[PDB]
Ligand binder design. Sequence first.
Ligand SMILES: NC(=O)CC[C@H](N)C(=O)O
Length: 415
Amino acid sequence: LRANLLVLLTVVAVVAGVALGLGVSGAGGALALGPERLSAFVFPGELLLRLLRMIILPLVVCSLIGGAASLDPGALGRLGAWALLFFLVTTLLASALGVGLALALQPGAASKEVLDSFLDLARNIFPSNLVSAAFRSYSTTYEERVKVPVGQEVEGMNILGLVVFAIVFGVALRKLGPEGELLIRFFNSFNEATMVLVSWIMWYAPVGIMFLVAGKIVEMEDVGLLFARLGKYILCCLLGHAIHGLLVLPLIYFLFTRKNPYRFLWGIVTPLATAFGTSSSSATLPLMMKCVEENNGVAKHISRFILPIGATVNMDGAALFQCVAAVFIAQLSQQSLDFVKIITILVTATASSVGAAGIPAGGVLTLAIILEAVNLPVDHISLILAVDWLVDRSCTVLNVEGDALGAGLLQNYVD
Ligand SMILES: NC(=O)CC[C@H](N)C(=O)O
């Protein structure tokens, strides 16, 4: 089956990239290649990242506009409220699990204010300019006059603000009635034409993933020794992801929906494999919607409203990764964590996951926020960036999975 062959190649691309990067790192690696050859060697991964980032804006905007315009305003409100509750609860559970695992295994045994960060999140939720929000996000810095906070739009897509605007605009189109049907059709057609482009990009995805992983483990120095140093951190992250995706989320699905959760997960295994490969939830969004609608029988209006929102707001993997990283860095620096600091870590990780952009390496940009909020040093992030390519991929799975089951849950609530 060609459809399964594509995903098999996408997954095997990670293994092939690991092998290629280990082979290149041996026999000199970066020093033997030199910057001129290093850039060319790593370029295909960068090209894949560029394509994935390009598709996100139209894909998310059109999908959300259509999904919101496809539901009654009251039904949409109830569904969105329950979906937000599910996302928040699952993210909090992931954060708590990560903190507990980090405190039990102790992987470390071997600046912006928090209020300003939350106000920046609120500002990004309501973009000041729709065109600017497509490639910029509000961010607060300080002038020492007393540190007075002054904000500006820095680079980085404001995907959360565009998501909110898309939902509101879809609701407005629904309320318009016959007059909004033309725009609903326009945005559905744009969404489908974007699904076509995503499907085409998925064919380049294997080569891009291979070269991305190979470059990211060639850039790593002393791969064996660095893995020996970060083994416990990697174990904590992957074990937390496994527990959350295989025990916690299916347990919630079973409790709220007596149907077997693992059959639902098998129904989307292919989207999960694509998410592990590309490490981007948005690239899996088309295939995930297809699988939940076709394999799991989730209604079209539930799926195409929930999954696009969850791909940006619901990131359980990101929250677990950030909590584990925070506790690991605190242990490295020998700072004890109390209930106040643990709760701060949990809340800040939830907010950061909500603010994350859902792109490869998109979860490390906001870990510094947690480290600053807990008064932990920010330099240690240098270590985490080395392992990201692996951990991030795991996160993506637990991210996209968190969406799918949620839809499967909410649909069952509708019935
Ligand atoms: N570490 C993370 O979860 C970042 C986001 C993740 N790469 C995704 O797109 O789902």
